[PDB]
């Protein structure tokens with residue numbers, strides 16, 4: 001499904017302004033991932049498109065991605081930044097990431113990726129210690145945990161440079177953010193919902209950012225750092 | 228009703244993300260447009276936060292807006308852009324712009340507008356003749372008639388620079404692709420739908436732009452000039 005009113009309206013967007021003219025690598029990678037069990041987590045085609053646009057408009061060169069899985073967001077990012085662009089990609093799994101690496105290599109853009117297996121927080125905390133790392137990223141995409149976003153934000157905010165833009169994914173958490181107090185939902189969406197709601201409030205009240213909640217994909221809250 | 232799944236989901240977006248850090252008077256100017264005698268149509272609360280973010284992101288200074296009325300997206304652009312640059316607030320035909328100019332003046336940002344009246348189609352053709360007005364606008368939002376988009380795009384594409392970004396409101400026309408010839412839709416919509424459907428197919432194929440169709444309010448197609 002999607003966050004729109006109908007599955008046909010959403011499809012219309014895909015069939016008319018997304019699929020036609022979409023590199024191909026995305027087409028491939030999207031096929032590889034379709035056979036994988038947890039394919040429900042893969043970023044949507046329209047959201048990959050929005051990221052591509054966004055990345056181009058802000059001339060992002062140096063970026064970071066938390067939550068890689070298979071590689072869709074990554075691929076999109078690597079194809080959008082310049083030939084000398086760099087991406088610090090973090091994910092706890094890694095078998096998954098290599099499932100799509102063949103494609104990224106076939107698209108000849110795997111050279112921009114610096115993959116690091118393991119939990120993101122530790123690594124983040126380490127970067128924070130070196131002052132030269134502060135404000136060194138143009139773009140940071142967070143599509144991981146959820147019950148860890150607020151924690152990421154604490155340090156991501158000093159690592160994003162004023163230029164800004166930090167993207168939090170699934171901010172509308174399958175609409176469960178306004179679901180009827182009596183319509184049981186899957187155990188995990190029920191769990192992460194308290195976190196997302198919590199995340200949203202903190203974000204809407206953070207003086208250091210700008211924020212915009214786009215209902216593309218499962219919702220991305222785009223944060224522009226102002227200081 | 229919006230384009231999202233529910234009305235609550237849409238409100239959740241406005242309650243938490245918009246109204247809180249919403250700009251000053253955007254609520255004034257929006258409660259003014261509610262006083263308008265014709266009520267005519269859609270005045271989305273989320274376009275402001277979106278336009279604001281997009282403009283600061285692309286660092287727009289020299290902008291142009293075609294299609295005012297009250298000036299809600301105009302106020303946004305005026306407040307969002309810097310005190311420096313100006314907004315060639317192209318025009319509209321009626322003076323509903325008058326109906327809202329006091330707020331855009333009260334928020335001391337009107338000193339950036341260059342409002343004009345009567346069809347812009349002429350002004351553009353005139354602007355084009357000079358081989359310098361070519362690619363001088365950093366951003367152009369078009370919320371004009373509807374059947375004139377295609378026509379505007381013709382000239383408009385020569386006036387924006389590299390990224391440029393041309394935006395077209397209602398490009399999703401409250402739900403274009405509805406049930407085939409058996410939908411109880413007001414003739415007024417079906418009439419304009421046609422232009423939209425074609426405005427979309429056309430923009431989707433133009434090889435000088437990248438485009439991205441966002442479900443913000445009534446749909447906004449962001450275009451990025453590449454050639």
Ligand SMILES: COc1cc(/C=C/C(=O)SCCNC(=O)CCNC(=O)C(O)C(C)(C)COP(=O)(O)OP(=O)(O)OC[C@H]2O[C@@H](n3cnc4c(N)ncnc43)[C@H](O)[C@@H]2OP(=O)(O)O)cc(O)c1O
Pocket residue numbers: 001002040041067143144145169170173174182183184185189218
């Ligand atoms: C960063 O990456 C990440 C991303 C994500 C993204 C998650 C997403 O969901 S985004 C969306 C992607 N996939 C999807 O689009 C959706 C997946 N599944 C569905 O949509 C889906 O078809 C469905 C949720 C299972 C169906 O829900 P539903 O709304 O159709 O059904 P329901 O539960 O409300 O059923 C209600 C009715 O069912 C009947 N019912 C009664 N008991 C039951 C029951 N135990 N089960 C089912 N139906 C029941 C009753 O008639 C009930 O009505 P009433 O009047 O309350 O008695 C997670 C991470 O963990 C990450 O890390």
Ligand SMILES: Nc1ncnc2c1ncn2[C@@H]1O[C@H](CSCC[C@H](N)C(=O)O)[C@@H](O)[C@H]1O
Pocket residue numbers: 041042043066067068069070071072073074090091092093118119120121143144145148
């Ligand atoms: N603490 C943590 N640190 C790093 N990665 C984590 C993590 N907790 C979960 N993850 C990972 O976050 C991943 C993101 S899945 C969604 C994003 C992906 N770029 C796509 O578009 O397909 C999960 O697959 C999981 O392995």
Ligand SMILES: Nc1ncnc2c1ncn2[C@@H]1O[C@H](CSCC[C@H](N)C(=O)O)[C@@H](O)[C@H]1O
Pocket residue numbers: 267268269270271274293294295296298299300301318319320370371372396
């Ligand atoms: N030729 C034209 N030029 C400019 N505005 C026009 C127009 N024809 C109609 N309009 C007005 O354009 C209105 C849409 S205004 C859409 C809202 C958006 N926030 C914005 O302010 O840009 C119509 O309701 C109508 O009354």
Ligand SMILES: [Ca+2]
Pocket residue numbers: 041042043143169170217218
């Ligand atoms: Ca996601």
Ligand SMILES: [Ca+2]
Pocket residue numbers: 269370396397445
């Ligand atoms: Ca409109």
